Design a protein around this ligand. Structure first.
Ligand SMILES: Cc1cc2nc3c(=O)[nH]c(=O)nc-3n(C[C@H](O)[C@H](O)[C@H](O)COP(=O)(O)OP(=O)(O)OC[C@H]3O[C@@H](n4cnc5c(N)ncnc54)[C@H](O)[C@@H]3O)c2cc1C
Ligand SMILES: Cc1cc2nc3c(=O)[nH]c(=O)nc-3n(C[C@H](O)[C@H](O)[C@H](O)COP(=O)(O)OP(=O)(O)OC[C@H]3O[C@@H](n4cnc5c(N)ncnc54)[C@H](O)[C@@H]3O)c2cc1C
Ligand SMILES: [Cl-]
Ligand SMILES: [Cl-]
Ligand SMILES: [Cl-]
Ligand SMILES: [Cl-]
Ligand SMILES: [Cl-]
Lengths: 237, 237
């Protein structure tokens, strides 16, 4: 069964986000993909009669050996705690297996030899992470990384991203909505007071719709043509 | 005073409530040696930011002079008083973040006596036992039995890592789940009477909450184990 993958690592990325490194158990194989794309993960949650399938963006660069995805605990401390995300967080240990369906998706980086801007918030960072590592392996110049999250504790991939930015000589800017920090802006992401490649860059977007629709209308306005704005949605939320 | 600044290199989920932290000195250079079974101290200042808090955490890997791993149970989940330091570490201390760490100490640790070795623990009691397993693996020790009790599959700390060691070293293990059955585990309380064990010659090392400790020590004595061959450390609650 080529779908059977085992969890080799389970890393906490932030307060609500945990990563899973997955490898074939039963003779499957790690297929190539473009950064931005997703795989389907199938598990059978506790109590539940049924198998359940959810999509998760690859969060690292394609290497043919292992996949990484990064899962937000959805609906935490709420009326309806997300079914698959909680099961993954609470029950799927290193050494446990899941069934996995091959990479696919309409959203992915395309090399156009132009500047690149990655913008995300919250768990929308996941496909941006795959793109960052890919660009890093390609020694792409002209990369800007713009990221928003509620606070330091929800700052997903903070260290990993910072090392990459410094190593490749890129630039980044982070906003914490709910508190202040050094080199961090406080509040919602504000894109007027900083240097962006508006005329020629490609702008890649991923986050809650509210966060995005805001910034999608914002770039249309700033002169960027819609053909240069690319975005992913984790469903209609 | 505080001891010394370390940085979280890795944050791995071990089970539903236990998360490991791999810590390296912010200095660089060697960290103090220790005996498997000993603990370090962690000190932080929780989001209720008045005072610092210090807690003992057991080393859960073999000593190697370069980094420390500890494994921390989220205490008091679902209670009126979720444990301050454990929740702070789980929720706020990310990879790349730093903590203050005190040097290894403690009177409970493995001593080579060329006897068969029994390791017995429950829940997070497994943490120092993990340092001991790794040390004995390194030393090619033969005649090791690992006995472990936890509530269920989702709380089965180090399940994969321990299975691998055992499969690599030719050792023996038995696992008990208090609240459910599973393939090749016993359901219920750890009962020793019917196990093949080196009662006359073995060293018995025990770690876990006091109630479990009292329960196991009474069984050991009734079976005929000399008190001088029972070594133990209590932490709970
Ligand atoms: C292309 C794609 C990529 C994705 N990538 C990622 C990723 O990288 N990381 C990641 O963590 N998640 C990602 N998701 C979201 C993921 O697929 C799941 O929908 C999510 O994990 C929730 O599933 P669940 O079973 O936990 O919650 P469910 O039990 O299915 O539903 C949770 C509850 O909240 C509402 N809800 C349902 N889905 C969502 C949602 N996605 N967001 C907010 N509220 C919701 C529902 O009405 C439901 O009542 C992606 C989704 C898509 C389509
Ligand atoms: C030698 C040794 C080794 C140890 N090794 C480990 C290890 O490897 N891993 C590990 O996870 N832990 C270990 N511990 C235990 C650990 O040091 C902590 O005691 C534990 O993490 C709890 O700390 P906390 O700050 O999270 O909880 P605390 O906040 O100290 O709470 C302690 C208990 O008191 C209750 N409580 C707190 N406040 C109140 C209040 N206002 N009213 C009523 N009740 C309250 C809490 O619910 C909790 O049950 C070890 C302890 C010792 C002595
Ligand atoms: Cl989010
Ligand atoms: Cl919110
Ligand atoms: Cl820090
Ligand atoms: Cl001695
Ligand atoms: Cl138990």
């Amino acid at each position: 069964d080529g779908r059977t993958f085992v969890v080799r690592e389970k890393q906490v990325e932030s307060a609500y986000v945990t990563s899973f490194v997955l490898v074939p158990a039963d003779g499957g194989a790690v297929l190539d993909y473009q950064p931005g794309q997703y795989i389907g993960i199938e598990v059978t949650p506790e109590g539940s009669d049924y198998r359940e399938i959810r999509q998760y963006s690859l969060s690292h660069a394609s290497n043919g050996r292992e996949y990484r995805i990064s899962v937000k605990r959805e609906g935490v401390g709420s009326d309806n705690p997300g079914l698959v995300s909680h099961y993954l967080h609470n029950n799927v240990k290193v050494g446990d297996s899941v069934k996995l369906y091959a990479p696919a998706g309409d959203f992915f980086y395309v090399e156009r030899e132009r500047p690149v801007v990655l913008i995300s918030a919250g768990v929308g960072a996941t496909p941006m992470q795959a793109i960052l590592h890919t660009l890093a392996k390609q020694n792409k110049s002209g990369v800007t990384y713009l990221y928003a999250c509620n606070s330091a504790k929800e700052h997903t991939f903070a260290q990993e991203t910072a090392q990459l930015i410094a190593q490749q000589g890129w630039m980044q800017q982070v906003w914490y909505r709910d508190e202040s920090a050094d080199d961090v802006l406080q509040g919602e992401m504000q894109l007027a007071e900083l240097i962006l490649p508006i005329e020629d860059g490609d702008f890649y977007l991923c986050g809650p719709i509210g966060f995005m629709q805001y910034v999608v209308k914002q770039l249309l306005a700033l002169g960027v043509d819609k053909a240069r704005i690319h975005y992913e949605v984790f469903g209609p939320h």
